Design a protein around this ligand. Structure first.
Ligand SMILES: O=c1ccn([C@H]2C[C@H](O)[C@@H](COP(=O)(O)OP(=O)(O)OP(=O)(O)O)O2)c(=O)[nH]1
Ligand SMILES: O=c1ccn([C@H]2C[C@H](O)[C@@H](COP(=O)(O)OP(=O)(O)OP(=O)(O)O)O2)c(=O)[nH]1
Ligand SMILES: [Zn+2]
Ligand SMILES: [Zn+2]
Lengths: 397, 399
């Protein structure tokens, strides 16, 4: 009849206990916050307008994962996974008794399958770079994938340790810097788990999810942070979608050669500054005295945002650990921030696959040159001060 | 010091309206619930906790101003017309220059810039002769020249409540309860009317001249598209989303080329605003149910998981149109009766409705679009019957 305890990192589901973040019975709630990231606000609108009963509980029939992921040892190693719930995809199975007992437990992960058709993959086929095999890649250009949507679930003591500050400071600052969101951050130190109203990520798996846990199977992977204006709209000011679709191409070939491929797509728009800040910086970049130069790229963000980047890649490897990933043979990525995080978490990276020069869009030179000067991996020449001062950016029109 | 500046929502001028002060550098100046950047205030907090970002930092807005002048328009002050974004949010540096100088730390909630967008479907449209570069709107590279505006949410709680035909205090209590107590000020600070929710906003892509949006004598082609990452980015063939998005973009480019103007609004409402986890759960149940993935079961599968078919509440979606001065949409590249009802209900005339051509429906999206048509989505001709909707049109899992 009371709220179930949570022992983060315990080796069984029973011992770990379920994340109860629903609101149908507040005496059962054992976390701060609520499911579905931002979309709790829309659920509130649906309740307030009469469309949805505040008493509704999901019918989870037939929703269970299409592919079995874990459990793996990483799920129970202390401090290893702190920003998602390793049991979040299998709650209907591992918490069946708690559900029947009356605890309204929602999945925070869902696993299904798809056929993804990307125009860049269809072109890769037309140009003889890819050849359909009928298993991973079809003649239509469709790739067969497993995909997993993963919503955030933060163990605040683990997150604090991840960031080298005390938990009470992390929680106080979370409370203050959001204008006082969730006073239980400072008022309920007994609650260790937080469901923030932020986007999560989506994992695309090419081949067998279980091979992600076998470091003897060659793994091609990219962690991609959302860039809507490119990932969807193809703006030529940045490398994002070209890098994403190049990685997808490489992942398909990886699977075809008998390995496995992984793309994680994490919702951190604009370096987790959001899109308004991102567009303000573009304007400042193009209007500054001297033109849009690579040697001012980072400074223009700094002046608006007070920081260069807020993605905190130190939590990004949790999804890899959830998947059992223990080694990445081909990391399709250049960022030294991502590379240090992944390898700093124990995961070997064998080959770093930089973005081929011919995929850089017409107004993305400023970005990629600044990034290589800042330490992003490249096999070739790093731009020196003189090359960074070239006005490589297009004028405002 | 000075107290918090009052806010008179929908006042005739920026000065009378008052700035949205949602920063945290000075708590005494805050005059709203919440903070800027939607979801991304959580990351800002992390940056401050880690010591990477000073809690005293304030934006240098030098050179950030809109690339295109949007408004002001009468709709910015019509009662209850715009309740989910701040019409002054793009121009705070100009219209609240005084208050900034009096020490009120005021951030934009809107940014307006320009871009060259290069979509593969547009390149292919050129190869097939559906589109022809003109050098001004569409380049031979396939790049289209656009103005784009990122709009983050700013809610006037009394106006939002009215829009939903419920009392303001009921709306605010339910927002508080159903989020697990997100912002107690919702129930504790009835004097604060304005709420900055931690949700995504939208991005408007304008083909041609933004000022023409306010001129109903200029032919407007428009789509309001709700985010579907798994299609809009990854092209899953279960749904129509990216085909509809890129079809609309093609139509907007052409509209601008003929002397008109185009608009695509891209709103962050993943999975009918249920989010992506619920969306994937429903796909699984669709494909495993007795009798297979059929269109007459499509909406039932969502209701069983989510308790509703849809949470996007299109009732707030026309606000951006009114912000842009749109009074008439000559070609609405959309089918949803929910969107159409909200748009016309809000006073915007719609002339032609442009359905998704049959040949752009992906291989496993037949279930979706048939169910939508049978549910009342616009279609130029016949709607499917009880039979037809009962055909197992959906691919099996793995499949
Ligand atoms: O000028 C820019 C440059 C980058 N981004 C954002 C988008 C996202 O937050 C990330 C997109 O790409 P990716 O996910 O692949 O990250 P990265 O740091 O560029 O590393 P790499 O591509 O080497 O993996 O950068 C901007 O908003 N404005
Ligand atoms: O099976 C589905 C069907 C739809 N969506 C969501 C995604 C988003 O919430 C919207 C996709 O794009 P759009 O913005 O164009 O909405 P629509 O209702 O289909 O109306 P129309 O396309 O006719 O304008 O529907 C799902 O999550 N699963
Ligand atoms: Zn980008
Ligand atoms: Zn879709």
């Amino acid at each position: 009849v009371g709220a179930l305890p949570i022992h983060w990192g315990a080796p069984t589901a029973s011992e770990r206990g379920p994340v109860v973040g629903t609101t149908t019975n507040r005496a059962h709630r054992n976390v701060i916050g609520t499911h579905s990231g931002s979309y709790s606000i829309y659920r509130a609108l649906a309740v307030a307008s009469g469309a949805l009963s505040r008493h509704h509980k999901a019918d989870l029939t037939d929703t269970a994962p299409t592919n079995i992921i874990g459990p793996y040892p990483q799920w129970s190693q202390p401090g290893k996974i702190v920003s998602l719930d390793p049991w979040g995809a299998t709650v209907a199975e591992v918490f069946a008794a708690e559900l029947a007992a009356g605890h309204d437990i929602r999945p925070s992960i869902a696993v299904t399958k798809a056929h993804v058709i990307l125009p860049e993959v269809m072109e890769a086929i037309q140009k003889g770079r890819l050849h359909p095999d009928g298993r991973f890649l079809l003649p239509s250009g469709a790739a067969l994938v497993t995909k997993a949507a993963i919503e955030p679930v933060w163990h605040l003591p683990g997150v604090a340790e991840r960031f080298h500050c005390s938990e009470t400071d992390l929680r106080r600052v979370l409370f203050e810097e959001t204008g006082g969101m969730y006073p239980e951050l400072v008022t309920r130190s007994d609650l260790e788990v937080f469901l923030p109203p932020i986007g999560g990520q989506t994992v695309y798996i090419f081949g067998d999810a279980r091979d992600l846990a076998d470091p003897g199977v060659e793994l091609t992977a990219r962690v991609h942070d959302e860039c809507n204006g490119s990932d969807v709209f193809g703006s030529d000011i940045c490398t994002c979608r070209p890098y994403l679709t190049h990685a997808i191409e490489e992942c398909i070939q990886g699977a075809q050669r008998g390995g496995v491929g992984l793309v994680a797509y994490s919702r951190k728009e604009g370096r987790a500054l959001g899109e308004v800040t991102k567009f303000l910086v573009y304007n400042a970049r193009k209007r500054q005295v001297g033109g849009d130069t690579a040697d001012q790229y980072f400074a223009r963000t700094e002046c608006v945002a007070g920081v260069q980047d807020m993605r905190f890649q130190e939590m990004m490897p949790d999804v890899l650990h959830w998947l059992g990933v223990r080694k990445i043979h081909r990391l399709v990525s250049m960022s030294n921030m991502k590379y240090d995080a992944i390898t700093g978490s124990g995961i070997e990276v064998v080959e770093r696959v930089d973005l081929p020069a011919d995929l850089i869009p017409a107004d993305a030179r400023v970005e990629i040159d600044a990034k290589m000067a800042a330490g992003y991996f490249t096999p070739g020449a790093v731009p020196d001060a003189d090359e960074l001062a070239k006005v490589k950016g297009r004028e405002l029109d």
